[PDB]
Structures are given as C-alpha cells and as structure tokens.
Curated annotation (Swiss-Prot):
Tissue-specificity statement: Expressed by the venom duct.
Highest taxon above the source species: Eukaryota
Annotated positions of the Asparagine amide modification: 27
Protein's job: Neurotoxin. In vivo, elicits 'spasmodic' symptomatology.
UniProt free text on domains: The cysteine framework is IX (C-C-C-C-C-C).
GO cellular component: extracellular region
Protein name: Conotoxin Gm9.1
Keywords of the record: Amidation, Cleavage on pair of basic residues, Disulfide bond, Neurotoxin, Secreted, Signal, Toxin
Native source organism of the sequence: Conus gloriamaris (Glory-of-the-Sea cone)
Family, as annotated: Belongs to the conotoxin P superfamily.
Residue pairs linked by disulfide bridges in the UniProt entry: 2-16, 6-18, 12-23
GO molecular function: toxin activity
Length: 27
C-alpha cells in the first residue's frame, strides 16, 4: 500500500514511515 520515497518523515503517502523502501507503513 505504501510505496514512495521520503526526504524527512511526513514525505510519505499517508501512514508510511521512512524506510529502506522509501516510504512504507509500519502498521
């Protein structure tokens, strides 16, 4: 569901967090 590339933390889609896959939801 979460697929992106963050530059900070809120640089994600929705409930995604900063991870090795750019942006991915922890939950």
């Amino acid at each position: 569901s979460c697929n992106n590339s963050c530059q900070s933390h809120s640089d994600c889609a929705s409930h995604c967090i900063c991870t090795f896959r750019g942006c991915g939801a922890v939950n």
